[PDB]
Design a protein around this ligand. Structure first.
Ligand SMILES: [Mg+2]
Ligand SMILES: [Mg+2]
Length: 466
């Protein structure tokens, strides 16, 4: 069977879509260790979001599947007679799933603690991580979009997928010629609004554009939305995620009967506060659960926060430099040869990252044998599964094939970069594979990747559902 499998993959890799592209393709049988396929396995290539495989593995090794993240609220001391306190601090310690509802629950605790008036100022403390918001080589033109959200120890996650450091912008048509209605979501009262958008005639062309001009905290909207067009929503990033959380907490407190007299801003506990009083706190779900939205949807913010959390745990420094060292050491301790690996970030967004298909398969093998193997493989997108939380970024791929509900793999695509690596379990043996394509000039070779995955599923003993 080996000869037929190899010839079939050989044939697939001849696709004109891979024209001028270099593709590292490696397939191994996890049970036996037999190398089923190998081409350019040692070639260093950009991994895109496949970098998250390394980050997740390191996170489970360093933080542990049972690790949880916390957020707290504290004053120098408990409220006095009139239920007053001076300055108040909202302190985040890396929770990548801190919601606005979580903030309200904490605001309620502040009230239930006996607080009625914050005579001082409200401060958002995200000193748990450093203030380096973006990776050095990330592209500035990508900054307005969710995947490029600024990194902070204190950030509000939006929706059930927990997209951090963003706000949901909504644009609703009015009558022809009238300005379009633009809502800034959570960022109302925080980010500035520059609405230049107008409502076009019914049946006209939609030319709406929602942007956040580089280096500003303004949501600029331009173009025209037809009067008969459906309302539009878009996630847009905001400058200083912690400052937004402060705004949102300010509103929460207000809604729970707690008045804030001073201003809202960034700042850490004075340290000259020996007995601070924690009026409220929140604990996130455990890492094993957080991995799901993280890996299924390829959440960049989660990845970078995990790296910095890894840095705090290994060196008391929530920094990329310390975090990336922690990741490499965690991988080596796992038995992975990191020689051909270059770590520049944990999400894979950075063009400075490098991996080799052999290194990916190596990781897949070691991780599959670790005590957290099940929680790890469960976080991976499952090919062709309609449920977003199961199919993830593979929900619309390989549906109706032998791979549907079988292939567990992480995706990763950017201009000129595409990858698919994971597992293909079956009665004919547990397979591990990695496909990394760099250099193609058109759309990512997703169909090529799919073809190979389906062929592997068939080799593993599966049949397409009829
Ligand atoms: Mg507001
Ligand atoms: Mg099957």
């Amino acid at each position: 069977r080996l000869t037929e499998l190899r010839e079939d993959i050989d044939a697939i890799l001849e696709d004109p879509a891979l024209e001028g592209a270099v593709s590292g393709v490696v397939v191994v049988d996890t049970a036996t260790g037999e190398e089923l396929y190998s081409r350019d396995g040692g070639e260093q290539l950009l991994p895109a979001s496949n970098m998250k495989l390394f980050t997740a593995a390191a996170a489970l090794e360093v933080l542990g599947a049972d690790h949880s993240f916390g957020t707290e609220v504290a004053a120098e001391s408990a409220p006095g007679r009139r239920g007053e306190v001076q300055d108040l601090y909202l302190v985040g310690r890396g929770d990548p799933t801190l919601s606005a509802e979580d903030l309200d629950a904490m605001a309620a605790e502040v009230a239930a603690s006996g607080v009625r008036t914050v005579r001082g100022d409200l401060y958002a403390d995200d000193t748990w991580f450093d203030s380096e918001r973006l990776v050095d080589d990330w592209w500035p033109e990508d900054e307005p979009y969710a995947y490029s959200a600024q990194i902070s120890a204190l950030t509000v996650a939006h929706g059930e997928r927990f997209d951090t450091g963003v706000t949901e912008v909504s644009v609703t048509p009015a009558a022809e010629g009238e300005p379009a209605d633009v809502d800034l979501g959570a960022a109302e009262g925080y980010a500035e609004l520059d609405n230049r958008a107008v409502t076009g005639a019914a049946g006209s062309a939609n030319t709406l554009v929602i942007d956040r001009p580089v280096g500003t905290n303004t949501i600029a909207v331009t173009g025209s939305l037809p009067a008969d067009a459906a309302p539009v929503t878009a996630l847009r990033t905001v400058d200083e995620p912690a400052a937004l959380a402060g705004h949102l907490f300010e509103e929460a407190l207000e809604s729970n009967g707690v008045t804030v007299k001073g201003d809202v801003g960034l700042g850490g506990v004075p340290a000259d506060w020996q007995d601070a009083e924690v009026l409220a706190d929140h604990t996130s779900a455990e890492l094993s659960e957080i991995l799901v939205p993280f890996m299924k949807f390829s959440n960049n913010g989660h990845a970078e926060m995990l790296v910095k959390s890894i840095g705090q745990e290994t060196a008391g420094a929530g920094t990329w430099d310390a975090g990336l060292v922690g990741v490499e050491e965690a991988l080596s301790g796992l038995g992975v040869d990191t020689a051909g690996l270059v770590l520049n970030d944990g999400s894979g967004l950075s063009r400075g990252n490098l991996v080799t298909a052999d290194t990916v398969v190596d990781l897949l093998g070691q991780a599959g044998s670790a005590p957290w193997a099940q929680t790890w493989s469960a976080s991976l997108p499952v090919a062709g599964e309609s449920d977003p939380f199961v199919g993830g970024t593979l929900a619309n791929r390989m549906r109706g094939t032998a791979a549907e509900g079988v292939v567990e793999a992480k995706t990763g695509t950017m201009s000129g970069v595409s990858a698919l690596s994971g597992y293909v379990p079956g009665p004919e043996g547990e397979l591990a594979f990695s496909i990394v394509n760099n250099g193609h000039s058109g759309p990512a070779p997703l169909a090529v990747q799919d073809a190979i995955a389906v062929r592997l599923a068939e080799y593993a003993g599966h049949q397409a559902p009829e």
